Design an enzyme around this catalytic site. Structure first.
Site, PDB file in Angstrom:
ATOM      1  N   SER A  54      37.300  24.169  -0.290  1.00 11.38           N
ATOM      2  CA  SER A  54      38.342  25.296  -1.844  1.00 11.38           C
ATOM      3  C   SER A  54      39.324  24.576  -1.490  1.00 11.38           C
ATOM      4  O   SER A  54      40.034  23.432  -1.160  1.00 11.38           O
ATOM      5  CB  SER A  54      38.446  27.312  -0.837  1.00 11.38           C
ATOM      6  OG  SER A  54      39.170  27.515  -2.135  1.00 11.38           O
ATOM      7  N   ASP A 174      33.098  27.895  -5.584  1.00 13.39           N
ATOM      8  CA  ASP A 174      33.653  27.866  -4.102  1.00 13.39           C
ATOM      9  C   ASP A 174      33.083  27.394  -2.552  1.00 13.39           C
ATOM     10  O   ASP A 174      32.554  28.325  -2.527  1.00 13.39           O
ATOM     11  CB  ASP A 174      35.008  29.215  -4.004  1.00 13.39           C
ATOM     12  CG  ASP A 174      35.519  28.540  -3.273  1.00 13.39           C
ATOM     13  OD1 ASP A 174      35.256  28.582  -1.563  1.00 13.39           O
ATOM     14  OD2 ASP A 174      36.746  28.884  -3.869  1.00 13.39           O
TER      15      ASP A 174
END
Lengths: 303, 303
Positions: A54, A174
């Site tokens: 991320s 993600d």
């Protein structure tokens, strides 16, 4: 630049693993700035391998492209808080797409100066997809697309569609859902691919720190689905900490330092929502303090 | 009973790992019923170690206390769907407390007939707490309290407070947040505590299966905070599948069978919400079919 110190090669595999955490990577950057200044060289000249997930993948990628931490900080400040300031799926998705294209342009995984791994989550199989490069790298995907995928926090961002060089289309979200703390996947890379013995590995895992949990009263003022927002943050924290505990159970004999300390300020929203640069800038000093509490061991690990 | 087959001892460590999944463990029980009938003995007479998380911990505990799978099925049918049918934090919490006390009464971790591990999540440190017994066992905590903690799916159930024998008070929530698939923690127990070589380990990891994802339209009819409900389920699935992938990366050389297949029916709510016994009973047949597709390898693994 000022970072002219040179290090000889040895048989030690030095691994850096950067957690995701919204815009709270200002903490990460504070730790990294002190490690860089301690070493006197860009981080790619000392570390063999960097993993990130991320917004930690943003930092990891810039490290692997040869950036110095002050340069990374400038890029992070000008792009990441704007993403987190978004309050719609359309706005979040476009802001992240703009970050990825503007920061990484058309760099590929053949352009890196060290080993890199960037973690995303496959939507259909619910398993990690790890984009790797060294020296088909990154499955043929650009760094921008890989970082974008690593950051696509559905249900609040759109899922990211990529097509690999082999022609396979995969939907990605993600990477924090499977490895917000990417350290175990970095250890797997060092042990299973680079065939390093556990004694010859040094792992530095830098988090984003831990701060007071935002309460429903506050979240209700800034998010209509506050329970989902709170659940996302708490599950992310548990995956981050429990991954560290699993590492300590399974790999006692891999020398490792994890730097992610607990603070009572600033009071912030969740990782998804916090964009106040005043609060976030104070995290750099907290990261510097976390380095200072570990400087003797970090010297013996590096150097 | 009818399960009179006896097996000699060997140097092979046979490990059973049961995922959590609401009331969908009817699938798990369908797989386990076929393994039991294949072996001709209660599962505790063939397996050295069983791990379970959340409602999989209910099954694991009953296995380790010496129950046969038909008996476990009767207990599961009469208690677990009632818990999932609850629609308030007070009702969920009391239903789970009643399950734990009624099913396990005052059994402790000194009462088990095999190795057991039950996983919960520590609220403050965000790391696993694993209750263990063999032959201070379970930290001095009753099986009922440990299973209750393993199942306490805050924010929808209250957190579970326990006091260890050493006098430490810890708040615990559902273990699915850190290890809904407990297999890696079971492997750590076999390798790090029982000091077994990887070649001498056999792992059977039974899930609850995978079914069509419930859509917002359906969840909106049965839950006011449908996005949090959907997020909880998807993150749970990712942790379950990604834990399996991490195992395959790190422990290629530990013989392992994972049984959790994908089906297009029944259409169900999430694990938190589904209690329709008609739908759930059909999962037993699905588990039996999943066993049938693996029976030759399971024979060579066991027996």
């Amino acid at each position: 630049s000022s970072l002219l110190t040179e290090y000889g090669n040895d048989n030690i595999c030095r691994v850096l693993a950067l957690d995701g955490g919204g815009a709270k990577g200002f903490y990460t950057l504070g730790v990294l700035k002190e490690i860089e200044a301690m070493l006197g060289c860009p981080l790619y000249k000392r570390f063999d391998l960097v993993f990130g997930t991320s917004t930690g993948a943003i930092i990891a990628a810039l490290i692997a492209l040869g950036y110095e931490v002050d340069q990374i900080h400038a890029l992070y400040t000008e792009h990441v808080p704007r993403v987190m300031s978004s309050r719609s799926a359309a706005a979040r998705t476009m802001a992240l797409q703009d970050l990825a294209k503007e920061v990484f342009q058309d760099k590929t995984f053949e352009d890196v100066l060290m080993g890199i791994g960037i973690v995303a989550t496959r939507w259909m199989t619910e398993r990690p997809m790890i984009f790797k490069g060294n020296v088909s790298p990154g499955f043929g995907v650009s760094i921008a697309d890989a970082v974008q995928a690593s950051c696509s926090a559905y249900p609040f961002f759109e899922r990211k569609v990529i097509v690999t060089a082999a022609g396979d289309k995969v939907e990605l979200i993600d990477g924090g859902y499977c490895a917000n703390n990417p350290t175990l996947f970095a250890i797997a890379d060092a042990t299973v691919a680079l065939k390093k013995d556990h004694k010859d590995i040094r792992v530095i895992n830098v988090g984003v720190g831990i701060y007071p949990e935002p309460k429903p009263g506050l979240l209700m003022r800034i998010a209509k689905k506050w329970l989902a927002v709170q659940l996302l943050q708490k599950t992310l924290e548990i995956n981050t900490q429990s991954m560290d505990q699993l590492r300590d159970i399974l790999f006692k004999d891999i020398p490792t330092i994890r730097i992610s300390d607990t603070f009572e300020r600033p009071e912030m929203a969740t990782d998804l929502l916090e964009y106040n640069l005043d609060k976030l800038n104070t995290l750099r000093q907290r990261g510097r303090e976390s380095f200072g509490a570990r400087e003797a061991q970090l010297r013996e690990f590096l150097i």
